[PDB]
Amino acid sequence: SHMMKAILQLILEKRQEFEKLPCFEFVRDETISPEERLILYPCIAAFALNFRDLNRYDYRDDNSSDYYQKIINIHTQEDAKHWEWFLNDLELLGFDKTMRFSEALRFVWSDDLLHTRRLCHNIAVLSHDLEPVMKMVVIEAMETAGLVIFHALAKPGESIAKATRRKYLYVADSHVEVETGHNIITILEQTQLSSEQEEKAKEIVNKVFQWSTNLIGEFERYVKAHRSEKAQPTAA
Amino acid sequence: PRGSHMMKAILQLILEKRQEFEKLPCFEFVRDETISPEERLILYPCIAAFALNFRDLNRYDYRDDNSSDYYQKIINIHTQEDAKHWEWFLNDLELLGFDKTMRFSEALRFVWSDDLLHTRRLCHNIAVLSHDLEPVMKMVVIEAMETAGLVIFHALAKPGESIAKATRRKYLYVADSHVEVETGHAVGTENIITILEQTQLSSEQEEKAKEIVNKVFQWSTNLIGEFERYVKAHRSEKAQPTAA
Numbered sequence A: 001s002h003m004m005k006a007i008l009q010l011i012l013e014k015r016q017e018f019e020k021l022p023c024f025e026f027v028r029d030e031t032i033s034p035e036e037r038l039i040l041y042p043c044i045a046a047f048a049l050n051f052r053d054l055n056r057y058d059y060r061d062d063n064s065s066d067y068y069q070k071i072i073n074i075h076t077q078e079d080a081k082h083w084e085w086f087l088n089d090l091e092l093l094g095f096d097k098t099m100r101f102s103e104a105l106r107f108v109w110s111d112d113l114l115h116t117r118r119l120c121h122n123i124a125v126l127s128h129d130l131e132p133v134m135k136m137v138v139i140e141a142m143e144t145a146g147l148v149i150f151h152a153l154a155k156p157g158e159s160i161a162k163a164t165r166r167k168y169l170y171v172a173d174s175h176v177e178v179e180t181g182h183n184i185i186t187i188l189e190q191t192q193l194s195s196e197q198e199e200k201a202k203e204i205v206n207k208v209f210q211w212s213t214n215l216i217g218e219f220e221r222y223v224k225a226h227r228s229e230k231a232q233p234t235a236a
Numbered sequence B: 001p002r003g004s005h006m007m008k009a010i011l012q013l014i015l016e017k018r019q020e021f022e023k024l025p026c027f028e029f030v031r032d033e034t035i036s037p038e039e040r041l042i043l044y045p046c047i048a049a050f051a052l053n054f055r056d057l058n059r060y061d062y063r064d065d066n067s068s069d070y071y072q073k074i075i076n077i078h079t080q081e082d083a084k085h086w087e088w089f090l091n092d093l094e095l096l097g098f099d100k101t102m103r104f105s106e107a108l109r110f111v112w113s114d115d116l117l118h119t120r121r122l123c124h125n126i127a128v129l130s131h132d133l134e135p136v137m138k139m140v141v142i143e144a145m146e147t148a149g150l151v152i153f154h155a156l157a158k159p160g161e162s163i164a165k166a167t168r169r170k171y172l173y174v175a176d177s178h179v180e181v182e183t184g185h186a187v188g189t190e191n192i193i194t195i196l197e198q199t200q201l202s203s204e205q206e207e208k209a210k211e212i213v214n215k216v217f218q219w220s221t222n223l224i225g226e227f228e229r230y231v232k233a234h235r236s237e238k239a240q241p242t243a244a
Ligand SMILES: N[C@@H](Cc1c[nH]c2c(Br)cc(Br)cc12)C(=O)O
Pocket: A044, A047, A048, A051, A079, A082, A083, A142, A143, A145, A146, A147, A149, A150, A179, A212, A215
């Protein structure tokens, strides 16, 4: 059992199962119009800005002298910028519609977006008392699940971007390329964990992908319940 | 000291923090009847970053319907009442003229504004603090949170009831009825403070209880500071209630 080969293999095993979820088969289906495949886009509003705060305030610790924490801090500086990309594509896709303040509040805190809204909350609770090397396991599992989601979402996104000649930033290949280079993974490959640390790392990987699966399930149920609320992008 | 005396100190510490919390300048502003009540409730939209997070805190973080600990069952009952008040907030939001029409992204940018950081993360910090606590320690979190909340809504009810009387409208969040519900407890349930009064704490429990009380009131103080800075930065965005 060399080093953290078992933990990294567990992440790869969870990733292959996560990739086969029915919501991703729907998003990758080029026989369906990309505007209908991005019906789930407004659901990300309950996550994208919570993810910003997760990287700003929960992962990050600008006062610590730990070298592993400083590498985490640099990693969070990049991920904390992507919320503006979400709001950019929100307007481009025609989902930045006008509404009452309370209607926006009821949408974000809707019971149908519970798992989406509480994903970053659960991650922060899990990672509050972890040592920096254990925080990296949380981040690495989170980055792996996110790359799966945006590798699929970029397919209808780039189709709309090309057809409308607009520059998309969130559901786009440029977002995927930044996430692909997400070094934390090099430290994990060279880190030896104790028996207690390895058991905790397995729990981390299981919880992250279980919570991510719950979020994807909410995305699929939203598409079924809002099958007519397709994206409405404009051409340039 | 004695286990009953170590707990007595914690409950006295909550009262000591409450007396200091009551003297914050934001509360002197809200209680000043020489200032228009519409201007004293300028801070009301700031509560949008808290009220619905507080609902989820009571729904999912405090509550645990699978445990057989009777203290946990009393916590669950207590959270069922507090988890209903978010609808009162949205009720008064519309009455005060703060439920304005806007872009979806503009509502998102408001809730996650950096000027509402401490307001938005208060329930988050409470949930992180209360995740691994035993039920009796969770009651200390709840009791401190309820004490700080009562201070805030005792003050907010003064301009709220003035507007309710002048406009003949039924307010539910910034109203005396909200304060009375928080002061009273559910029928047939045992008071949380009474259970705490009869609880003997260990030396380790007293150390955690002091940290809990200090953190809850410090985070509440940070939220109030954001409310005061918001009023100064948005002095013209007064409430606009309508009459009957
Ligand atoms: N690239 C994502 C980060 C991310 C990381 N993990 C994610 C999961 Br699981 C679901 C969703 Br929706 C997003 C993510 C972002 O910038 O918001």
